[PDB]
């Protein structure tokens, strides 16, 4: 059965007195549709081993639109993209994902970025050509990528 | 007393030119294939009006739009990424009306380079993301080209 330990961190949740050093820290970057993020968390929960700390920027309820809340969201995203051991970036064909592409550029040369970009995405060839140039692993679906991790 | 300005496009070649003796500037940002919003030409003309200097401007905006043929498109992206890397300075101008998704990819790519200058017009649909990210990584952010070009 499932034996992995999975802790999920959200921008609007706090897990005080947790040692982030003993976990594999994974940032779930990509399309926010108000939910591949929950299915990815469930996938890690189903694993037979490991300690995972997943940084999920997708809140259960959408943003209010209030400025200080928005700044908290962007700063939470950038701080946890930096803290992550691995960035799982999933881009759906239906999305425009403009800030996902900003984040992709930011962590393109980090060595910890894994891009999953669905064919049909309106800027797919840009993503393919840029990842090729900088040697970033590029997958077409989450099944192919998540097999590379058991 | 006039400046020397050479403009290099994805569909042009200046093979008898030593790029090492020029200040290389990449014109990143909004590409509008309308006669009115050609800010890249106006920027090139601004450099041409200077009384001194040697400037090599990498302009990714072609006079005619892309055909949509795949090898032509790949040439465009590879030309952009190569000349973004070669540039001494990246002038990135983002107009309020634009969606500029590849401009934001390029901004992320050269965010920590120290050679990126961002001009982002208020009203741009992802302005606060640009403002907050530039603030975090210490990238100069301007609201218009006039304010930025005075700092040259
Ligand atoms: Cl959200
Ligand atoms: Cl073009």
UniProtKB/TrEMBL annotation, chain A:
Pfam families per record: Nuc_deoxyri_tr2
Gene3D superfamilies reported in the protein's UniProt record: 3.40.50.450
InterPro entries: Nuc_deoxyri_tr2
Protein name: Nucleoside 2-deoxyribosyltransferase
